Design an enzyme around this catalytic site. Sequence first.
Site, PDB file in Angstrom:
ATOM      1  N   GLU A  37       0.844  -1.188   0.000  1.00  0.00           N
ATOM      2  CA  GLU A  37       0.000   0.000   0.000  1.00  0.00           C
ATOM      3  C   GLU A  37       0.881   1.240   0.000  1.00  0.00           C
ATOM      4  O   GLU A  37       1.783   1.366   0.835  1.00  0.00           O
ATOM      5  CB  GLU A  37      -0.933   0.013   1.213  1.00  0.00           C
ATOM      6  CG  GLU A  37      -1.623   1.346   1.443  1.00  0.00           C
ATOM      7  CD  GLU A  37      -2.462   1.777   0.258  1.00  0.00           C
ATOM      8  OE1 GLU A  37      -3.274   0.959  -0.225  1.00  0.00           O
ATOM      9  OE2 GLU A  37      -2.305   2.929  -0.196  1.00  0.00           O
ATOM     10  N   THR A 112     -19.299   5.305   3.241  1.00  0.00           N
ATOM     11  CA  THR A 112     -20.523   5.279   4.027  1.00  0.00           C
ATOM     12  C   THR A 112     -21.224   3.925   3.970  1.00  0.00           C
ATOM     13  O   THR A 112     -22.406   3.825   4.321  1.00  0.00           O
ATOM     14  CB  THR A 112     -21.470   6.390   3.569  1.00  0.00           C
ATOM     15  OG1 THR A 112     -21.619   6.334   2.147  1.00  0.00           O
ATOM     16  CG2 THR A 112     -20.918   7.754   3.954  1.00  0.00           C
ATOM     17  N   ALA A 114     -22.786   1.881   2.271  1.00  0.00           N
ATOM     18  CA  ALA A 114     -23.922   1.454   1.468  1.00  0.00           C
ATOM     19  C   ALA A 114     -23.519   0.306   0.548  1.00  0.00           C
ATOM     20  O   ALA A 114     -22.505   0.384  -0.149  1.00  0.00           O
ATOM     21  CB  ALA A 114     -24.471   2.624   0.645  1.00  0.00           C
ATOM     22  N   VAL A 211       4.057   0.622  -5.624  1.00  0.00           N
ATOM     23  CA  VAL A 211       4.248  -0.323  -6.719  1.00  0.00           C
ATOM     24  C   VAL A 211       4.275   0.474  -8.017  1.00  0.00           C
ATOM     25  O   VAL A 211       3.245   0.986  -8.465  1.00  0.00           O
ATOM     26  CB  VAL A 211       3.147  -1.389  -6.740  1.00  0.00           C
ATOM     27  CG1 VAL A 211       3.273  -2.248  -7.987  1.00  0.00           C
ATOM     28  CG2 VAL A 211       3.219  -2.246  -5.487  1.00  0.00           C
ATOM     29  N   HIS A 389     -17.611   6.535  -7.662  1.00  0.00           N
ATOM     30  CA  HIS A 389     -17.958   5.193  -8.131  1.00  0.00           C
ATOM     31  C   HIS A 389     -17.582   5.104  -9.608  1.00  0.00           C
ATOM     32  O   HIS A 389     -18.434   5.238 -10.489  1.00  0.00           O
ATOM     33  CB  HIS A 389     -19.455   4.899  -7.915  1.00  0.00           C
ATOM     34  CG  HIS A 389     -19.905   5.054  -6.496  1.00  0.00           C
ATOM     35  ND1 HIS A 389     -21.088   5.674  -6.155  1.00  0.00           N
ATOM     36  CD2 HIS A 389     -19.335   4.664  -5.332  1.00  0.00           C
ATOM     37  CE1 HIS A 389     -21.225   5.664  -4.841  1.00  0.00           C
ATOM     38  NE2 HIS A 389     -20.176   5.057  -4.318  1.00  0.00           N
ATOM     39  N   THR A 435     -19.205  -1.095  -4.565  1.00  0.00           N
ATOM     40  CA  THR A 435     -18.220  -1.771  -3.724  1.00  0.00           C
ATOM     41  C   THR A 435     -18.650  -3.188  -3.361  1.00  0.00           C
ATOM     42  O   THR A 435     -17.825  -4.110  -3.356  1.00  0.00           O
ATOM     43  CB  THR A 435     -17.959  -0.953  -2.460  1.00  0.00           C
ATOM     44  OG1 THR A 435     -17.469   0.344  -2.825  1.00  0.00           O
ATOM     45  CG2 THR A 435     -16.927  -1.652  -1.584  1.00  0.00           C
TER      46      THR A 435
END
Length: 458
Positions: A37, A112, A114, A211, A389, A435
């Site tokens: 990460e 959030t 959802a 990376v 999104h 997600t």
Amino acid sequence: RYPAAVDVAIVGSGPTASAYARILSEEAPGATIAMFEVGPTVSNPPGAHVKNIEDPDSRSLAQRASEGPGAGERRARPGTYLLQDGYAFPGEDGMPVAAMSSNVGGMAAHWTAACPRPGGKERIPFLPDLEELLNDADRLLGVTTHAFDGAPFSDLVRERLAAVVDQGRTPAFRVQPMPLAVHLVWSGSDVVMGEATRDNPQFELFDESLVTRVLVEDGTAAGVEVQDRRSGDTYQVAARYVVVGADALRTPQLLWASGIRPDALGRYLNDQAQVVFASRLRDVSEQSGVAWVPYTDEAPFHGQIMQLGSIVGLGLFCAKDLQREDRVAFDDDTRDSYGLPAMRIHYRLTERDHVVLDRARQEIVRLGKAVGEPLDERPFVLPPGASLHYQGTTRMGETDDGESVCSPDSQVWQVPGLFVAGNGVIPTATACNPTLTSVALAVRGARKIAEEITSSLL
Ligand SMILES: Cc1cc2nc3c(=O)[nH]c(=O)nc-3n(C[C@H](O)[C@H](O)[C@H](O)COP(=O)(O)OP(=O)(O)OC[C@H]3O[C@@H](n4cnc5c(N)ncnc54)[C@H](O)[C@@H]3O)c2cc1C
Ligand SMILES: OC[C@H]1O[C@H](O)[C@H](O)[C@@H](O)[C@@H]1O
């Protein structure tokens, strides 16, 4: 600092990447795993949600640490940062508010929670087990629809909406509590990898590790080049498998810089146009929960009504008319704050996009009046990129056809062993929160790898 070789290298620590660590950790417990990460560890356990940090000062610093290079209308939410340039262009709309996160947990450490299901043409046809993977996506995220049962207004909000929405719809497309990944406590990537990964002896998580390239030897995933961001030294970690789950923008950036440049990569980028509106209930933080107005092919919008609790928020997300000119391009001649090919978004709403967008404004007002007393008079359209999104940058396909970047198992076509994870893997025009679907797709790839690792002779 890093090992020399592993069985599986994971680029990114988002919810999808941590799903690969999850399924692998509990299905292939022997293999060795190295998760890299770029951003720092900003919570405990690693990837935990910032909302769960009691101190509002420890939480703000935890957020600004996630804003990567932007650590100094068109502004980004906490825990996210925008592009320097190349977001908008003349003759196009662009994504001025397209944001990213750089921290252990990814945006899953700020979202959030959802987690709705796809319906109609949102669901991916070439996946006869989608319903199974979706439920596993529920397990990993700790999804729950009964998080706000005692909530006083959650029931009333759901009642008023149903009276205006439920006509003619089947039970799955009526108003209902939003499936949430609420673990008063929010789920991040800490919940996805969970204890299986956190107690897995062969799994290691390296923050501060950039990376900059996916190694390929003989046309097959050979490993990754990892740049230790605390010493500036560049390593090279070998592996049989490489999972790239660095979000729908930086994932094609890593592949493009790696030489993996299919004509489909980065194209068909689609964003969910978001429409915001508010209403005040008529009567006299668990208080209202979240309401879900499912998507339908005849109304391609996805409805969220949340407790912000007399006042409720209304957001509508639009599925898009997918196009080729919607693409994230990369320029080798110009680097970015991380040193990779500077990106640039070619995004334009077609007339069909506007016919749906204005439909979302008419409908969100109908929903606002159904629940109570509209505050503002007119719904506000958020600039492209606000939904956070982004789908289709490494879209999935049943076969190779120049417009799919990976296979149904997320395995990049021209590079065996290289898998992609995240929202970019979605190929269909969706309006719901991806997600949960992205985790479902990631679970399908992860247990494809575990199938091969444990069945091979190596
Ligand atoms: C305020 C907010 C609310 C949201 N609410 C919702 C919601 O209700 N529902 C929903 O479905 N979604 C929601 N989202 C979006 C959701 O967080 C994303 O869909 C999801 O996190 C995507 O996960 P991912 O693993 O694919 O990518 P990410 O979580 O973004 O993971 C990418 C990670 O990879 C790292 N990385 C990138 N490049 C490299 C590299 N070269 N080397 C190493 N690491 C690298 C990044 O630092 C980052 O940590 C919300 C987002 C925000 C900001
Ligand atoms: O502004 C807050 C909103 O940010 C994002 O757009 C999310 O999609 C939504 O879930 C959240 O409520």
